[PDB]
PDB file of C-alpha atoms and ligand atoms in Angstrom:
ATOM      1  CA  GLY A   1      94.558 114.278 -21.470  1.00  0.00           C
ATOM      2  CA  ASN A   2      97.993 114.198 -22.591  1.00  0.00           C
ATOM      3  CA  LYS A   3      98.726 118.030 -22.577  1.00  0.00           C
ATOM      4  CA  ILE A   4     101.241 119.277 -19.758  1.00  0.00           C
ATOM      5  CA  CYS A   5     101.531 122.792 -18.363  1.00  0.00           C
ATOM      6  CA  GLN A   6     103.943 124.299 -15.864  1.00  0.00           C
ATOM      7  CA  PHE A   7     103.630 127.624 -14.192  1.00  0.00           C
ATOM      8  CA  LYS A   8     105.621 129.666 -11.517  1.00  0.00           C
ATOM      9  CA  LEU A   9     103.636 130.779  -8.486  1.00  0.00           C
ATOM     10  CA  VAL A  10     104.877 133.052  -5.625  1.00  0.00           C
ATOM     11  CA  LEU A  11     103.194 133.580  -2.031  1.00  0.00           C
ATOM     12  CA  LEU A  12     103.529 136.914  -0.634  1.00  0.00           C
ATOM     13  CA  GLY A  13     102.161 138.454   2.750  1.00  0.00           C
ATOM     14  CA  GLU A  14     102.897 139.423   6.209  1.00  0.00           C
ATOM     15  CA  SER A  15     104.391 136.884   8.638  1.00  0.00           C
ATOM     16  CA  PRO A  16     102.751 134.941  10.256  1.00  0.00           C
ATOM     17  CA  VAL A  17      99.381 134.592   8.462  1.00  0.00           C
ATOM     18  CA  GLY A  18      99.722 131.020   7.435  1.00  0.00           C
ATOM     19  CA  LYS A  19     101.463 131.216   4.122  1.00  0.00           C
ATOM     20  CA  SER A  20     103.782 128.201   4.611  1.00  0.00           C
ATOM     21  CA  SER A  21     100.796 126.349   5.961  1.00  0.00           C
ATOM     22  CA  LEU A  22      98.677 127.235   2.857  1.00  0.00           C
ATOM     23  CA  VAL A  23     101.471 125.564   0.681  1.00  0.00           C
ATOM     24  CA  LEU A  24     101.958 122.641   2.867  1.00  0.00           C
ATOM     25  CA  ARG A  25      98.368 121.760   2.712  1.00  0.00           C
ATOM     26  CA  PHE A  26      98.291 121.961  -0.921  1.00  0.00           C
ATOM     27  CA  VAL A  27     101.555 120.228  -1.560  1.00  0.00           C
ATOM     28  CA  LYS A  28     101.746 117.518   1.147  1.00  0.00           C
ATOM     29  CA  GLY A  29      98.093 117.496   2.565  1.00  0.00           C
ATOM     30  CA  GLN A  30      99.757 118.199   6.065  1.00  0.00           C
ATOM     31  CA  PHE A  31      99.076 120.860   8.606  1.00  0.00           C
ATOM     32  CA  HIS A  32     101.558 121.700  11.485  1.00  0.00           C
ATOM     33  CA  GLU A  33     100.250 123.530  14.506  1.00  0.00           C
ATOM     34  CA  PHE A  34     103.969 124.481  15.095  1.00  0.00           C
ATOM     35  CA  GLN A  35     105.611 125.748  12.155  1.00  0.00           C
ATOM     36  CA  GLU A  36     109.010 127.379  12.163  1.00  0.00           C
ATOM     37  CA  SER A  37     109.152 130.738  10.759  1.00  0.00           C
ATOM     38  CA  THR A  38     110.349 130.486   7.125  1.00  0.00           C
ATOM     39  CA  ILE A  39     113.895 131.982   6.524  1.00  0.00           C
ATOM     40  CA  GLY A  40     114.381 133.801   3.165  1.00  0.00           C
ATOM     41  CA  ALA A  41     112.188 131.404   1.116  1.00  0.00           C
ATOM     42  CA  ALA A  42     111.173 127.971   0.649  1.00  0.00           C
ATOM     43  CA  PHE A  43     110.412 126.066  -2.711  1.00  0.00           C
ATOM     44  CA  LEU A  44     107.868 123.431  -3.343  1.00  0.00           C
ATOM     45  CA  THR A  45     106.274 121.684  -6.158  1.00  0.00           C
ATOM     46  CA  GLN A  46     102.843 119.884  -6.841  1.00  0.00           C
ATOM     47  CA  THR A  47     101.504 118.278  -9.992  1.00  0.00           C
ATOM     48  CA  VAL A  48      97.715 118.102 -10.501  1.00  0.00           C
ATOM     49  CA  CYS A  49      95.021 117.032 -12.975  1.00  0.00           C
ATOM     50  CA  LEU A  50      93.175 120.078 -14.579  1.00  0.00           C
ATOM     51  CA  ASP A  51      90.492 118.695 -17.052  1.00  0.00           C
ATOM     52  CA  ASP A  52      92.595 117.359 -19.815  1.00  0.00           C
ATOM     53  CA  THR A  53      95.966 118.887 -18.555  1.00  0.00           C
ATOM     54  CA  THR A  54      98.574 117.899 -16.238  1.00  0.00           C
ATOM     55  CA  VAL A  55      99.700 120.954 -14.444  1.00  0.00           C
ATOM     56  CA  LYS A  56     102.874 121.441 -12.478  1.00  0.00           C
ATOM     57  CA  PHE A  57     103.113 124.322  -9.964  1.00  0.00           C
ATOM     58  CA  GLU A  58     106.685 125.679  -9.041  1.00  0.00           C
ATOM     59  CA  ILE A  59     105.984 127.466  -5.794  1.00  0.00           C
ATOM     60  CA  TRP A  60     108.062 130.132  -3.891  1.00  0.00           C
ATOM     61  CA  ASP A  61     107.035 130.312  -0.299  1.00  0.00           C
ATOM     62  CA  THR A  62     108.265 133.666   0.890  1.00  0.00           C
ATOM     63  CA  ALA A  63     109.384 134.823   4.379  1.00  0.00           C
ATOM     64  CA  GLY A  64     107.072 137.569   5.039  1.00  0.00           C
ATOM     65  CA  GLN A  65     109.093 139.609   7.679  1.00  0.00           C
ATOM     66  CA  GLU A  66     109.953 143.146   6.402  1.00  0.00           C
ATOM     67  CA  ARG A  67     113.771 142.566   6.530  1.00  0.00           C
ATOM     68  CA  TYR A  68     113.138 140.023   3.471  1.00  0.00           C
ATOM     69  CA  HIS A  69     111.063 142.651   1.448  1.00  0.00           C
ATOM     70  CA  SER A  70     114.053 143.442  -0.751  1.00  0.00           C
ATOM     71  CA  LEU A  71     114.399 139.883  -1.781  1.00  0.00           C
ATOM     72  CA  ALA A  72     110.759 139.560  -2.854  1.00  0.00           C
ATOM     73  CA  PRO A  73     111.414 140.591  -6.502  1.00  0.00           C
ATOM     74  CA  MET A  74     113.719 137.551  -6.902  1.00  0.00           C
ATOM     75  CA  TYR A  75     110.706 135.428  -6.578  1.00  0.00           C
ATOM     76  CA  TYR A  76     107.853 137.461  -8.141  1.00  0.00           C
ATOM     77  CA  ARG A  77     109.784 138.839 -11.244  1.00  0.00           C
ATOM     78  CA  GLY A  78     109.285 135.568 -13.215  1.00  0.00           C
ATOM     79  CA  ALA A  79     106.064 134.680 -11.550  1.00  0.00           C
ATOM     80  CA  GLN A  80     102.942 133.803 -13.728  1.00  0.00           C
ATOM     81  CA  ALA A  81     100.812 134.012 -10.675  1.00  0.00           C
ATOM     82  CA  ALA A  82     100.875 135.083  -6.960  1.00  0.00           C
ATOM     83  CA  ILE A  83      98.745 134.452  -3.963  1.00  0.00           C
ATOM     84  CA  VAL A  84      98.870 137.381  -1.719  1.00  0.00           C
ATOM     85  CA  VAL A  85      97.885 136.075   1.968  1.00  0.00           C
ATOM     86  CA  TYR A  86      96.465 137.881   5.037  1.00  0.00           C
ATOM     87  CA  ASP A  87      94.808 136.498   8.206  1.00  0.00           C
ATOM     88  CA  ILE A  88      91.103 137.133   8.570  1.00  0.00           C
ATOM     89  CA  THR A  89      91.580 137.785  12.272  1.00  0.00           C
ATOM     90  CA  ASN A  90      94.241 140.527  11.741  1.00  0.00           C
ATOM     91  CA  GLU A  91      93.332 143.741   9.949  1.00  0.00           C
ATOM     92  CA  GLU A  92      96.963 144.924   9.736  1.00  0.00           C
ATOM     93  CA  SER A  93      97.762 141.901   7.780  1.00  0.00           C
ATOM     94  CA  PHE A  94      94.768 142.571   5.361  1.00  0.00           C
ATOM     95  CA  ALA A  95      96.273 146.303   4.919  1.00  0.00           C
ATOM     96  CA  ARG A  96      99.807 144.795   4.267  1.00  0.00           C
ATOM     97  CA  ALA A  97      98.395 142.460   1.711  1.00  0.00           C
ATOM     98  CA  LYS A  98      96.913 145.444  -0.264  1.00  0.00           C
ATOM     99  CA  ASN A  99     100.363 146.912  -0.377  1.00  0.00           C
ATOM    100  CA  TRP A 100     101.740 143.648  -1.710  1.00  0.00           C
ATOM    101  CA  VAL A 101      99.150 143.825  -4.445  1.00  0.00           C
ATOM    102  CA  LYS A 102     100.176 147.358  -5.206  1.00  0.00           C
ATOM    103  CA  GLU A 103     103.759 146.242  -5.595  1.00  0.00           C
ATOM    104  CA  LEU A 104     102.832 143.519  -7.998  1.00  0.00           C
ATOM    105  CA  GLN A 105     100.640 145.486 -10.154  1.00  0.00           C
ATOM    106  CA  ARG A 106     103.521 148.000 -10.447  1.00  0.00           C
ATOM    107  CA  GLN A 107     106.554 145.787 -10.602  1.00  0.00           C
ATOM    108  CA  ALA A 108     105.763 142.217 -11.598  1.00  0.00           C
ATOM    109  CA  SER A 109     104.578 140.900 -15.055  1.00  0.00           C
ATOM    110  CA  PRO A 110     101.743 142.835 -16.360  1.00  0.00           C
ATOM    111  CA  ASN A 111      99.976 139.734 -17.126  1.00  0.00           C
ATOM    112  CA  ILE A 112     100.433 138.078 -13.618  1.00  0.00           C
ATOM    113  CA  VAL A 113      97.250 136.475 -12.230  1.00  0.00           C
ATOM    114  CA  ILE A 114      97.013 137.551  -8.540  1.00  0.00           C
ATOM    115  CA  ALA A 115      94.799 135.807  -5.960  1.00  0.00           C
ATOM    116  CA  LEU A 116      94.126 137.024  -2.532  1.00  0.00           C
ATOM    117  CA  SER A 117      93.637 134.419   0.271  1.00  0.00           C
ATOM    118  CA  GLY A 118      91.927 135.389   3.504  1.00  0.00           C
ATOM    119  CA  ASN A 119      93.598 132.690   5.613  1.00  0.00           C
ATOM    120  CA  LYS A 120      92.750 131.169   8.989  1.00  0.00           C
ATOM    121  CA  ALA A 121      88.938 131.033   8.063  1.00  0.00           C
ATOM    122  CA  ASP A 122      88.288 128.442  10.808  1.00  0.00           C
ATOM    123  CA  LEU A 123      89.129 131.341  13.374  1.00  0.00           C
ATOM    124  CA  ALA A 124      85.925 133.355  12.097  1.00  0.00           C
ATOM    125  CA  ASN A 125      84.967 133.697  15.833  1.00  0.00           C
ATOM    126  CA  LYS A 126      87.850 136.126  15.943  1.00  0.00           C
ATOM    127  CA  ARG A 127      87.142 137.753  12.453  1.00  0.00           C
ATOM    128  CA  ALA A 128      88.711 141.288  11.972  1.00  0.00           C
ATOM    129  CA  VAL A 129      88.201 141.373   8.319  1.00  0.00           C
ATOM    130  CA  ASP A 130      84.695 141.293   6.745  1.00  0.00           C
ATOM    131  CA  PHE A 131      84.354 138.710   3.901  1.00  0.00           C
ATOM    132  CA  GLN A 132      82.262 141.077   1.775  1.00  0.00           C
ATOM    133  CA  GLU A 133      84.663 144.014   2.281  1.00  0.00           C
ATOM    134  CA  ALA A 134      87.572 141.945   0.996  1.00  0.00           C
ATOM    135  CA  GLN A 135      85.550 140.496  -1.831  1.00  0.00           C
ATOM    136  CA  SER A 136      84.883 144.010  -3.035  1.00  0.00           C
ATOM    137  CA  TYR A 137      88.398 145.005  -2.709  1.00  0.00           C
ATOM    138  CA  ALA A 138      89.402 141.947  -4.742  1.00  0.00           C
ATOM    139  CA  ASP A 139      86.580 142.801  -7.434  1.00  0.00           C
ATOM    140  CA  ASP A 140      87.722 146.198  -7.580  1.00  0.00           C
ATOM    141  CA  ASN A 141      91.457 145.110  -8.264  1.00  0.00           C
ATOM    142  CA  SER A 142      90.810 142.212 -10.402  1.00  0.00           C
ATOM    143  CA  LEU A 143      92.081 139.524  -7.848  1.00  0.00           C
ATOM    144  CA  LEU A 144      90.852 136.100  -7.335  1.00  0.00           C
ATOM    145  CA  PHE A 145      89.694 135.887  -3.672  1.00  0.00           C
ATOM    146  CA  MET A 146      88.834 133.028  -1.414  1.00  0.00           C
ATOM    147  CA  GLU A 147      88.875 132.569   2.399  1.00  0.00           C
ATOM    148  CA  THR A 148      90.918 129.479   3.146  1.00  0.00           C
ATOM    149  CA  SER A 149      91.896 127.358   6.086  1.00  0.00           C
ATOM    150  CA  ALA A 150      95.074 125.487   5.928  1.00  0.00           C
ATOM    151  CA  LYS A 151      94.190 124.015   9.244  1.00  0.00           C
ATOM    152  CA  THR A 152      90.842 122.373   7.917  1.00  0.00           C
ATOM    153  CA  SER A 153      91.717 122.372   4.232  1.00  0.00           C
ATOM    154  CA  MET A 154      88.814 124.718   3.313  1.00  0.00           C
ATOM    155  CA  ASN A 155      89.322 126.041  -0.234  1.00  0.00           C
ATOM    156  CA  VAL A 156      93.094 125.251  -0.270  1.00  0.00           C
ATOM    157  CA  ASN A 157      93.163 123.039  -3.333  1.00  0.00           C
ATOM    158  CA  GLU A 158      90.374 125.194  -4.733  1.00  0.00           C
ATOM    159  CA  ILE A 159      92.270 128.306  -4.849  1.00  0.00           C
ATOM    160  CA  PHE A 160      95.292 126.831  -6.344  1.00  0.00           C
ATOM    161  CA  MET A 161      93.174 125.043  -8.995  1.00  0.00           C
ATOM    162  CA  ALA A 162      91.183 128.323  -9.766  1.00  0.00           C
ATOM    163  CA  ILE A 163      94.414 130.051 -10.494  1.00  0.00           C
ATOM    164  CA  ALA A 164      95.557 127.224 -12.650  1.00  0.00           C
ATOM    165  CA  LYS A 165      92.185 127.416 -14.765  1.00  0.00           C
ATOM    166  CA  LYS A 166      92.854 131.171 -15.303  1.00  0.00           C
ATOM    167  CA  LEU A 167      96.365 130.855 -16.571  1.00  0.00           C
TER     168      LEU A 167
HETATM  169  N1  GDP B   1      93.903 128.128  12.984  1.00  0.00           N
HETATM  170  C1  GDP B   1      94.609 128.320  12.009  1.00  0.00           C
HETATM  171  N2  GDP B   1      95.997 128.415  12.292  1.00  0.00           N
HETATM  172  C2  GDP B   1      96.651 128.418  11.018  1.00  0.00           C
HETATM  173  C3  GDP B   1      96.178 128.343   9.748  1.00  0.00           C
HETATM  174  N3  GDP B   1      97.277 128.458   8.761  1.00  0.00           N
HETATM  175  C4  GDP B   1      98.498 128.504   9.560  1.00  0.00           C
HETATM  176  N4  GDP B   1      98.063 128.415  10.849  1.00  0.00           N
HETATM  177  C5  GDP B   1      98.998 128.537  12.065  1.00  0.00           C
HETATM  178  O1  GDP B   1      99.572 129.878  12.405  1.00  0.00           O
HETATM  179  C6  GDP B   1     100.958 129.883  12.437  1.00  0.00           C
HETATM  180  C7  GDP B   1     101.818 130.405  11.364  1.00  0.00           C
HETATM  181  O2  GDP B   1     101.732 129.748  10.263  1.00  0.00           O
HETATM  182  P1  GDP B   1     102.858 129.717   9.069  1.00  0.00           P
HETATM  183  O3  GDP B   1     102.374 128.827   7.968  1.00  0.00           O
HETATM  184  O4  GDP B   1     104.205 129.325   9.621  1.00  0.00           O
HETATM  185  O5  GDP B   1     102.638 131.268   8.712  1.00  0.00           O
HETATM  186  P2  GDP B   1     103.691 132.168   7.698  1.00  0.00           P
HETATM  187  O6  GDP B   1     104.806 132.737   8.790  1.00  0.00           O
HETATM  188  O7  GDP B   1     102.848 133.162   6.973  1.00  0.00           O
HETATM  189  O8  GDP B   1     104.466 131.193   6.777  1.00  0.00           O
HETATM  190  C8  GDP B   1     101.283 128.402  12.711  1.00  0.00           C
HETATM  191  O9  GDP B   1     101.110 128.218  14.160  1.00  0.00           O
HETATM  192  C9  GDP B   1     100.158 127.598  11.946  1.00  0.00           C
HETATM  193  O10 GDP B   1      99.891 126.276  12.538  1.00  0.00           O
HETATM  194  C10 GDP B   1      94.948 128.305   9.547  1.00  0.00           C
HETATM  195  O11 GDP B   1      94.289 128.235   8.347  1.00  0.00           O
HETATM  196  N5  GDP B   1      94.157 128.285  10.651  1.00  0.00           N
HETATM  197 MG1   MG B   2     106.276 130.858   6.243  1.00  0.00          MG
END
């Protein structure tokens, strides 16, 4: 197809849960066991083929530390979609993700598409958040949920493409 679409996506979530790794896997097909903590935010782009459309993603990878919380609106205000990330081995990060979802529902665009990534799914032997519980939470809050692994690539391209399909 010759159609072209571009949308703004922001990633939010506690640090560290693998936010930068998720983006790096999607954008560069890389995974770094040793990642420097993000300072403020990082910007990345990726262009893909979705049926008959060429879709370009403008992605804001936010630093998740609480001291950066006040800067989050700079990145989500104009966002068409968000991926709120948690780590499936860390229940506290899952609770933090629900608070990010609440903030987006109240302060971001009313039509923003919100995805929820239960990351580090390759560490299921250390699971702290039940898949079905997360799925139910996502269903009840109209969120696009998938467990992902930046380390193995599991569902990484899939969650980004699913968001694009719904925009
Ligand atoms: N096992 C595993 N480690 C991961 C995964 N995603 C990220 N990590 C690791 O967890 C750490 C934090 O990741 P990073 O992307 O910097 O987290 P951020 O602080 O949320 O941006 C790094 O040591 C990564 O290699 C994943 O899916 N599986
Ligand atoms: Mg980061």
